[PDB]
Amino acid sequence: DSFWEVGNYKRTVKRIDDGHRLCSDLMNCLHERARIEKAYAQQLTEWARRWRQLVEKGPQYGTVEKAWMAFMSEAERVSELHLEVKASLMNDDFEKIKNWQKEAFHKQMMGGFKETKEAEDGFRKAQKPWAKKLKEVEAAKKAHHAACKEEKLAISREANSKADPSLNPEQLKKLQDKIEKCKQDVLKTKEKYEKSLKELDQGTPQYMENMEQVFEQCQQFEEKRLRFFREVLLEVQKHLDLSNVAGYKAIYHDLEQSIRAADAVEDLRWFRANHGPGMAMNWPQFEE
Amino acid sequence: DSFWEVGNYKRTVKRIDDGHRLCSDLMNCLHERARIEKAYAQQLTEWARRWRQLVEKGPQYGTVEKAWMAFMSEAERVSELHLEVKASLMNDDFEKIKNWQKEAFHKQMMGGFKETKEAEDGFRKAQKPWAKKLKEVEAAKKAHHAACKEEKLAISREANSKADPSLNPEQLKKLQDKIEKCKQDVLKTKEKYEKSLKELDQGTPQYMENMEQVFEQCQQFEEKRLRFFREVLLEVQKHLDLSNVAGYKAIYHDLEQSIRAADAVEDLRWFRANHGPGMAMNWPQFEE
């Protein structure tokens, strides 16, 4: 599972397709939060429109009605703010990532991204010679082991050729030859297996240099997405932060003033003059 | 049309039933806003839960992953905030109004509010005498025209007499009886009519005093609800304003701090040592 194993570089190459996937994930994440902002804003607008009508058609008038009516304005202003959050999330943030994704990942007409194919081809090139050599080394490995294995089998051949009745002179003096055949045969493949081994060893330095070369390029492409993510995220934080927006605090300073403008006395003074004792009256008199 | 007309004090009595209804309107208004605040919170909670899972299972790791995850924590903090707005609107404001409504208005077994029935009884009792005197004046009025018109019924007959060729003897004088007596009651009813009028005009002062006494009582009761509405709306105002929450700004300070912690280089070093050239490798050797 080590990077240096043949083909294990694929994990690094995979990170490229993953990088494109992560940009799409972030985009969906933000799109989803934007819908949530719009939803809260829309429910507030609906609530404001519904209650503006109910208060207006209801029996509450005067300065107290204005105090109550101020809450519909508050909801409408909080809604505008969340619609701005949504607008900033989609028009700026979402679009910025959508465009970066497009400028960094290019489809190769055949499927997949050109940057992935590039990385893959660079790693192959850099691994090709070493892989070829490692290949012959393995062959020389299964060879030496094939010899050793075929040795003891012959060593026990003439051995188990004693507890047998029909033990001809040749049929027994010849089976002892196979042992000698395998004897040097093993030492033979041995040197073979040893040659390729040290040949591989002397070829690893170059091999590692080429692999680290390609890996570094990948690290550089990845660094771009990572820095880009931090940059956009700092911008998303700003768009969501309503705690440092004066316009938000203004909503409530204004709401408070409207409420404080409620004047019980003045309201009742009007009622007296327009619906109570304060009303003029045409008292009865002689009428013929 | 005027407050002083018999029975027109009803509009003042109605304000009482309306006062109770307005308390319920306010409650529903707050209740409706509370559901909206909870809904936004519910959506934030879900968005956070969903993305935490998608981010953790996805291919983004290191400090950049932590920066992204900071947004799930923000949605959670904001959710708790809005859940609390709902809690304050319902546990404090809604309840406060509900308790005020139960202490200010008392439903009676026979139906209707005690304080509405009191107002009605109070006005009736303050208007009873004057109303009775008015009817008297009304009777003297219609009884005056009855004779005032009864005379011109016989007086006209005087003409229907001259037109009578027969010119009946005493039957002519007989008509001269319904002309003197009829014009006789005209002076009687007149004096009566003017007498009852003078009487009404005499009791009018006490009438106004009695009505204004009951009216002032209705004004003071209404004042209680108007002042209460102002007091509670200021509390609602404070419960809606998230700027009033000490840690509101900390949510965004923490989010920003977590994002700033994103370190492309650090993340890249990790990948190399754990997934790249930095990994250990058991280079091939002589095996047997």
XYZ file of C-alpha atoms in Angstrom:
576
model
C 0.000 0.000 0.000
C 3.110 2.184 -0.141
C 3.232 5.046 -2.661
C 6.373 3.495 -4.153
C 4.595 0.240 -4.985
C 3.828 -0.127 -8.692
C 0.633 1.738 -9.522
C 0.014 3.040 -6.000
C 0.354 6.555 -7.394
C -3.283 6.232 -8.441
C -4.385 7.618 -5.083
C -2.657 10.911 -5.896
C -4.225 10.917 -9.358
C -7.625 10.204 -7.811
C -7.332 13.374 -5.715
C -7.653 15.290 -9.013
C -11.082 13.917 -9.919
C -11.938 14.343 -6.224
C -10.974 18.014 -6.344
C -13.528 18.588 -9.071
C -16.092 16.640 -7.044
C -15.401 18.746 -3.923
C -15.986 22.017 -5.832
C -19.366 20.642 -6.864
C -20.083 19.557 -3.297
C -19.276 23.009 -1.927
C -21.494 24.557 -4.597
C -24.421 22.323 -3.592
C -23.780 23.013 0.073
C -24.000 26.769 -0.522
C -26.948 26.458 -2.924
C -28.791 24.551 -0.185
C -28.034 27.175 2.458
C -29.170 29.876 0.045
C -32.553 28.170 -0.353
C -32.854 28.062 3.438
C -32.175 31.797 3.658
C -34.743 32.535 0.943
C -37.288 30.361 2.765
C -36.947 32.202 6.049
C -37.102 35.530 4.174
C -40.231 34.470 2.246
C -42.068 33.266 5.351
C -41.316 36.582 7.040
C -42.713 38.488 4.044
C -45.844 36.341 4.087
C -46.254 36.861 7.837
C -45.857 40.644 7.406
C -48.411 40.872 4.591
C -50.894 38.698 6.496
C -50.634 40.665 9.735
C -50.586 44.064 8.068
C -54.042 43.230 6.766
C -55.346 41.728 10.009
C -54.224 44.699 12.081
C -55.630 47.194 9.556
C -59.033 45.490 9.435
C -59.053 44.957 13.193
C -60.230 47.237 16.074
C -56.799 48.539 17.092
C -56.080 52.095 15.915
C -54.044 55.122 17.025
C -50.387 55.135 18.101
C -50.643 51.625 19.554
C -51.694 50.319 16.139
C -48.624 52.020 14.645
C -46.499 50.372 17.332
C -47.880 46.973 16.378
C -47.670 47.699 12.649
C -43.938 48.403 13.113
C -43.369 44.680 13.572
C -44.547 43.966 10.025
C -41.852 46.403 8.837
C -39.239 44.635 10.985
C -40.081 41.265 9.404
C -39.925 42.822 5.922
C -36.503 44.341 6.637
C -35.109 41.145 8.153
C -36.407 39.348 5.028
C -34.606 41.783 2.701
C -31.388 41.023 4.596
C -31.711 37.264 4.211
C -32.486 37.720 0.514
C -29.213 39.655 0.292
C -27.412 36.801 2.042
C -28.921 34.465 -0.562
C -27.975 36.848 -3.404
C -24.388 37.104 -2.168
C -24.145 33.335 -1.719
C -25.370 32.605 -5.253
C -24.271 35.594 -7.353
C -20.816 35.853 -5.796
C -19.763 32.668 -3.945
C -21.561 29.999 -5.975
C -20.564 31.636 -9.261
C -16.946 32.086 -8.195
C -16.570 28.373 -7.475
C -18.469 27.377 -10.633
C -16.067 29.487 -12.704
C -12.928 28.299 -10.889
C -14.020 24.676 -11.383
C -14.300 25.332 -15.127
C -10.963 27.074 -15.439
C -9.104 24.360 -13.512
C -10.671 21.183 -14.915
C -10.889 20.514 -18.636
C -12.747 17.611 -20.183
C -10.684 15.514 -22.549
C -12.843 14.552 -25.500
C -13.147 10.882 -24.575
C -14.277 11.362 -20.995
C -12.478 12.429 -17.846
C -10.304 15.462 -17.179
C -7.117 16.374 -19.037
C -5.385 17.180 -15.753
C -6.050 13.652 -14.488
C -4.807 12.032 -17.709
C -1.730 14.273 -17.533
C -0.854 13.214 -13.985
C -1.488 9.565 -14.843
C 0.765 9.695 -17.905
C 3.533 11.459 -16.011
C 3.504 8.854 -13.252
C 3.514 6.028 -15.804
C 6.422 7.479 -17.758
C 8.366 7.980 -14.526
C 7.569 4.441 -13.355
C 7.850 2.594 -16.681
C 11.554 1.635 -16.577
C 11.488 0.680 -12.895
C 8.289 -1.337 -13.350
C 9.794 -3.224 -16.278
C 12.884 -4.075 -14.244
C 10.854 -5.034 -11.174
C 8.932 -7.332 -13.502
C 11.962 -9.356 -14.586
C 13.106 -9.406 -10.960
C 9.886 -11.169 -9.966
C 10.381 -13.686 -12.764
C 13.881 -14.349 -11.443
C 12.227 -14.699 -8.042
C 9.690 -17.373 -8.978
C 12.586 -19.008 -10.823
C 15.011 -19.386 -7.927
C 12.124 -20.579 -5.762
C 11.140 -22.990 -8.529
C 14.671 -24.392 -8.475
C 14.946 -24.707 -4.695
C 11.493 -26.297 -4.625
C 12.460 -28.732 -7.371
C 15.619 -29.518 -5.407
C 14.365 -31.045 -2.154
C 11.871 -33.000 -4.255
C 14.802 -34.720 -5.962
C 16.810 -34.964 -2.739
C 13.965 -36.972 -1.215
C 13.453 -38.852 -4.480
C 16.529 -41.073 -4.197
C 15.934 -41.060 -0.440
C 12.468 -42.589 -0.736
C 14.084 -44.823 -3.348
C 15.389 -47.250 -0.732
C 12.248 -48.477 1.021
C 11.153 -49.650 -2.429
C 11.641 -53.224 -3.725
C 12.385 -52.713 -7.426
C 15.405 -50.433 -7.029
C 17.237 -50.972 -10.313
C 20.901 -49.872 -10.586
C 20.237 -47.155 -13.161
C 16.701 -46.269 -12.064
C 18.341 -45.311 -8.767
C 21.786 -44.125 -9.852
C 20.076 -41.777 -12.309
C 17.530 -40.254 -9.925
C 20.533 -39.043 -7.941
C 21.566 -37.031 -10.998
C 18.405 -34.915 -10.940
C 19.570 -33.769 -7.514
C 22.816 -32.579 -9.091
C 20.816 -31.080 -11.953
C 18.787 -29.052 -9.463
C 21.916 -28.621 -7.341
C 23.565 -26.063 -9.619
C 20.260 -25.172 -11.283
C 19.327 -23.414 -8.044
C 22.669 -21.629 -7.757
C 22.080 -20.656 -11.388
C 18.738 -18.891 -10.985
C 20.172 -17.587 -7.718
C 22.715 -15.381 -9.485
C 20.044 -14.431 -12.026
C 17.700 -13.342 -9.238
C 20.627 -11.500 -7.648
C 21.658 -9.691 -10.833
C 18.270 -8.119 -11.566
C 18.003 -7.296 -7.865
C 21.089 -5.077 -7.770
C 20.163 -3.724 -11.201
C 16.846 -2.603 -9.728
C 18.636 -1.104 -6.736
C 20.859 1.003 -8.984
C 17.756 2.131 -10.852
C 15.677 3.277 -7.884
C 17.407 6.648 -7.381
C 16.387 7.850 -10.840
C 12.991 6.229 -10.297
C 12.346 8.152 -7.083
C 13.499 11.435 -8.608
C 11.024 11.105 -11.470
C 8.134 10.098 -9.213
C 8.720 12.959 -6.778
C 8.839 15.248 -9.805
C 5.349 14.301 -10.951
C 3.992 14.181 -7.398
C 5.222 17.728 -6.815
C 3.300 19.000 -9.845
C 0.196 17.344 -8.402
C 0.843 18.960 -4.994
C 0.966 22.302 -6.814
C -2.365 21.794 -8.583
C -3.902 20.681 -5.288
C -2.434 23.689 -3.471
C -4.367 25.902 -5.848
C -7.746 24.406 -4.952
C -6.898 24.430 -1.235
C -5.954 28.108 -1.219
C -8.958 28.920 -3.394
C -11.256 27.144 -0.898
C -9.907 29.154 2.039
C -10.385 32.365 0.056
C -13.967 31.702 -0.940
C -14.846 30.407 2.521
C -13.642 33.650 4.094
C -15.993 35.384 1.683
C -18.902 33.079 2.538
C -18.380 33.870 6.254
C -18.682 37.575 5.501
C -21.907 37.106 3.542
C -23.505 35.088 6.356
C -22.375 37.431 9.169
C -25.341 39.616 10.051
C -23.919 40.293 13.536
C -21.627 43.058 12.259
C -24.109 44.697 9.889
C -25.314 48.071 11.150
C -28.377 47.804 8.917
C -29.485 44.894 11.086
C -29.200 46.757 14.397
C -30.924 49.742 12.762
C -34.022 47.621 12.255
C -34.473 47.216 16.006
C -33.477 50.736 17.036
C -36.248 51.891 14.680
C -38.738 49.286 15.903
C -38.109 50.404 19.485
C -38.741 54.042 18.597
C -42.024 53.208 16.859
C -43.175 51.176 19.862
C -42.160 53.882 22.306
C -44.262 56.296 20.254
C -47.338 54.433 21.535
C -49.243 56.972 23.676
C -52.179 55.549 25.643
C -53.475 58.962 26.719
C -53.411 60.540 23.261
C -55.185 57.531 21.782
C -57.970 57.730 24.374
C -58.160 61.502 24.071
C -59.142 60.931 20.443
C -61.708 58.278 21.323
C -63.370 60.664 23.775
C -63.528 63.423 21.174
C -64.611 61.186 18.285
C -66.730 58.475 19.906
C -67.416 59.612 23.447
C -68.670 62.561 25.586
C -66.564 64.945 23.519
C -69.017 64.627 20.646
C -71.337 67.549 19.946
C -75.060 66.979 20.443
C -78.287 68.485 19.135
C -80.357 68.359 22.308
C -84.167 68.385 21.884
C -86.199 71.598 21.857
C -89.658 72.926 20.983
C -90.529 71.485 17.569
C -93.837 72.190 15.834
C -75.151 59.491 15.811
C -73.795 61.323 18.851
C -72.486 59.589 21.982
C -75.312 61.294 23.868
C -78.104 59.796 21.774
C -80.001 57.082 23.655
C -78.013 53.854 23.498
C -75.104 55.135 21.404
C -72.757 54.485 24.320
C -72.624 50.967 22.875
C -69.507 51.716 20.835
C -67.663 52.316 24.103
C -69.009 49.055 25.485
C -67.921 47.212 22.329
C -64.335 48.397 22.723
C -64.323 46.110 25.739
C -65.167 42.951 23.795
C -62.657 44.179 21.182
C -59.933 44.634 23.766
C -60.076 40.957 24.638
C -60.098 40.023 20.935
C -57.028 42.194 20.322
C -55.175 40.324 23.061
C -55.890 37.116 21.165
C -54.858 38.689 17.857
C -51.508 39.701 19.352
C -50.993 36.197 20.757
C -51.654 34.522 17.391
C -49.412 37.063 15.683
C -46.515 36.197 18.018
C -47.335 32.500 17.853
C -47.180 32.653 14.046
C -43.834 34.445 14.113
C -42.574 31.852 16.627
C -43.351 28.965 14.248
C -41.446 30.808 11.512
C -38.385 31.268 13.729
C -38.459 27.585 14.662
C -38.833 26.581 10.990
C -35.655 28.437 10.016
C -33.935 26.738 12.958
C -35.188 23.324 11.896
C -33.838 23.857 8.389
C -30.435 25.020 9.654
C -30.211 21.959 11.927
C -30.961 19.619 9.030
C -28.593 21.374 6.636
C -25.854 21.038 9.268
C -26.528 17.352 9.923
C -26.575 16.580 6.190
C -23.370 18.374 5.356
C -21.498 17.108 8.367
C -22.131 13.614 7.011
C -21.331 14.522 3.400
C -18.138 16.334 4.372
C -16.913 13.601 6.724
C -17.577 10.852 4.172
C -16.179 12.907 1.295
C -12.515 13.228 0.147
C -11.736 16.580 1.811
C -9.542 16.249 4.903
C -7.000 18.263 6.885
C -7.428 21.855 8.041
C -9.427 22.712 4.933
C -12.008 20.141 6.002
C -12.142 21.779 9.434
C -12.700 25.181 7.819
C -15.637 23.791 5.844
C -17.029 22.030 8.906
C -17.008 25.388 10.695
C -20.053 26.274 8.604
C -22.011 23.316 9.981
C -21.233 24.600 13.502
C -22.449 28.098 12.536
C -25.783 26.783 11.260
C -26.117 24.955 14.581
C -25.365 28.015 16.711
C -27.794 30.110 14.628
C -30.394 27.362 14.916
C -30.119 27.421 18.709
C -30.463 31.197 18.536
C -33.733 31.103 16.610
C -35.087 28.216 18.630
C -34.551 30.527 21.608
C -36.435 33.371 19.904
C -39.373 30.996 19.588
C -38.951 29.991 23.248
C -38.955 33.616 24.421
C -41.906 34.599 22.232
C -43.942 31.678 23.562
C -42.735 31.147 27.132
C -42.488 34.827 27.938
C -44.376 37.195 25.631
C -47.285 34.947 24.566
C -47.786 33.791 28.148
C -47.567 37.308 29.561
C -50.355 38.462 27.231
C -52.382 35.321 27.925
C -52.121 35.886 31.692
C -53.000 39.570 31.324
C -56.074 38.632 29.298
C -57.258 36.205 31.979
C -56.755 38.765 34.757
C -58.365 41.653 32.862
C -61.377 39.863 31.333
C -63.607 37.367 33.138
C -66.030 35.151 31.201
C -69.288 34.584 33.067
C -71.519 31.518 33.288
C -74.387 33.330 31.553
C -72.056 34.345 28.727
C -70.176 37.544 27.984
C -67.462 39.357 29.913
C -68.050 40.618 33.429
C -66.435 43.950 32.614
C -68.538 44.372 29.445
C -71.769 43.645 31.302
C -70.725 46.099 34.010
C -70.167 48.838 31.443
C -73.528 48.148 29.842
C -75.351 48.182 33.182
C -73.456 51.309 34.213
C -74.406 53.277 31.099
C -78.030 52.141 31.215
C -78.361 53.268 34.825
C -76.788 56.635 34.039
C -79.125 57.074 31.080
C -82.336 55.584 32.511
C -83.899 58.784 33.923
C -82.928 61.086 31.053
C -84.128 58.401 28.638
C -87.438 58.252 30.502
C -87.773 62.032 30.416
C -86.992 61.958 26.699
C -89.867 59.544 26.067
C -92.099 61.906 28.037
C -91.023 64.799 25.830
C -91.592 62.499 22.853
C -95.156 61.737 23.934
C -95.892 65.405 24.579
C -94.495 66.052 21.105
C -96.709 63.611 19.200
C -99.658 64.486 21.439
C -99.190 68.145 20.528
C -99.410 67.573 16.772
C -102.440 65.332 17.288
C -104.485 68.292 18.533
C -102.582 70.842 16.457
C -103.849 68.865 13.465
C -107.181 67.921 15.032
C -108.155 71.596 15.028
C -107.478 72.221 11.339
C -109.770 69.247 10.743
C -112.799 71.057 12.149
C -111.603 74.510 11.092
C -111.581 73.294 7.495
C -115.089 71.927 8.011
C -116.114 75.554 8.502
C -115.526 76.008 4.775
C -117.446 72.823 3.979
C -120.266 74.506 5.894
C -120.510 77.756 3.938
C -120.575 75.598 0.811
C -123.683 73.907 2.209
C -126.767 75.577 0.653
C -128.918 74.006 3.366
C -126.958 75.952 5.989
C -128.223 73.871 8.908
C -129.320 75.905 11.983
C -127.496 74.955 15.183
C -125.705 72.220 13.242
C -123.469 75.071 12.085
C -122.647 76.221 15.608
C -121.944 72.603 16.556
C -118.949 72.787 14.234
C -117.925 75.971 16.043
C -117.414 73.795 19.117
C -114.792 71.533 17.570
C -112.976 74.711 16.547
C -112.670 76.298 19.985
C -112.114 73.147 22.035
C -109.663 71.732 19.501
C -107.711 74.986 19.571
C -108.058 74.718 23.347
C -106.022 71.537 23.781
C -103.416 73.064 21.474
C -102.502 75.380 24.342
C -102.719 72.553 26.883
C -100.454 70.112 25.055
C -98.161 73.037 24.260
C -97.631 73.960 27.908
C -97.133 70.276 28.703
C -94.710 69.768 25.816
C -92.748 72.840 26.906
C -92.946 71.678 30.514
C -91.452 68.234 29.856
C -88.857 69.911 27.639
C -87.884 72.348 30.384
C -87.684 69.367 32.732
C -85.397 67.430 30.401
C -83.216 70.493 29.832
C -83.051 70.702 33.628
C -81.872 67.149 34.275
C -79.429 67.157 31.357
C -76.507 68.305 33.542
C -76.746 65.353 35.933
C -77.263 63.109 32.911
C -73.949 64.195 31.396
C -72.187 63.787 34.742
C -73.458 60.214 35.110
C -72.449 59.244 31.567
C -69.007 60.837 31.772
C -68.449 58.990 35.044
C -69.017 55.610 33.408
C -67.083 56.683 30.314
C -64.021 57.683 32.339
C -64.123 54.212 33.880
C -64.081 52.641 30.425
C -61.197 54.914 29.439
C -59.096 53.826 32.413
C -59.748 50.160 31.678
C -58.820 50.660 28.027
C -55.724 52.557 29.191
C -54.612 49.423 31.040
C -54.560 47.392 27.827
C -52.933 50.130 25.775
C -50.095 50.567 28.292
C -49.720 46.782 28.584
C -49.408 46.451 24.786
C -46.624 49.037 24.727
C -44.792 47.338 27.593
C -44.996 43.852 26.097
C -44.116 44.916 22.546
C -40.847 46.361 23.829
C -40.074 42.939 25.309
C -40.975 41.192 22.040
C -38.690 43.660 20.245
C -35.759 42.679 22.458
C -36.482 38.952 21.996
C -36.388 39.247 18.207
C -33.164 41.248 18.055
C -30.336 38.699 17.986
C -27.917 41.585 18.587
C -29.107 41.343 22.192
C -27.460 37.918 22.444
C -23.975 38.186 23.935
C -22.542 35.390 21.843
C -24.112 36.330 18.513
C -20.925 37.944 17.235
C -18.808 35.072 18.638
C -20.482 32.691 16.191
C -18.929 34.601 13.335
C -15.647 35.325 15.073
C -15.255 31.566 15.655
C -16.264 30.741 12.049
C -13.670 33.166 10.686
C -10.999 31.882 13.041
C -11.637 28.299 11.977
C -11.445 29.255 8.293
C -8.232 31.255 8.792
C -6.810 28.039 10.260
C -7.020 26.471 6.794
C -3.391 25.775 5.839
C -2.775 24.511 2.298
C 0.898 23.758 2.983
C 0.282 21.873 6.223
C -2.405 19.804 4.511
C -0.071 19.060 1.606
C 2.773 17.937 3.876
C 0.456 15.430 5.546
C -0.630 13.971 2.221
C 2.971 13.491 1.113
C 4.155 11.790 4.303
C 1.047 9.614 4.557
C 0.091 9.064 0.899
C 3.037 10.152 -1.223
C 6.858 9.890 -1.540
C 7.151 10.329 2.221
C 5.738 6.852 2.810
C 7.956 3.985 3.917
C 8.827 1.430 1.237
C 10.169 -2.099 1.620
C 12.432 -2.088 -1.439
C 13.020 -5.546 -3.018
C 15.773 -7.793 -1.654
C 17.039 -11.367 -1.877
C 14.299 -13.655 -0.568
C 14.303 -17.434 -0.144
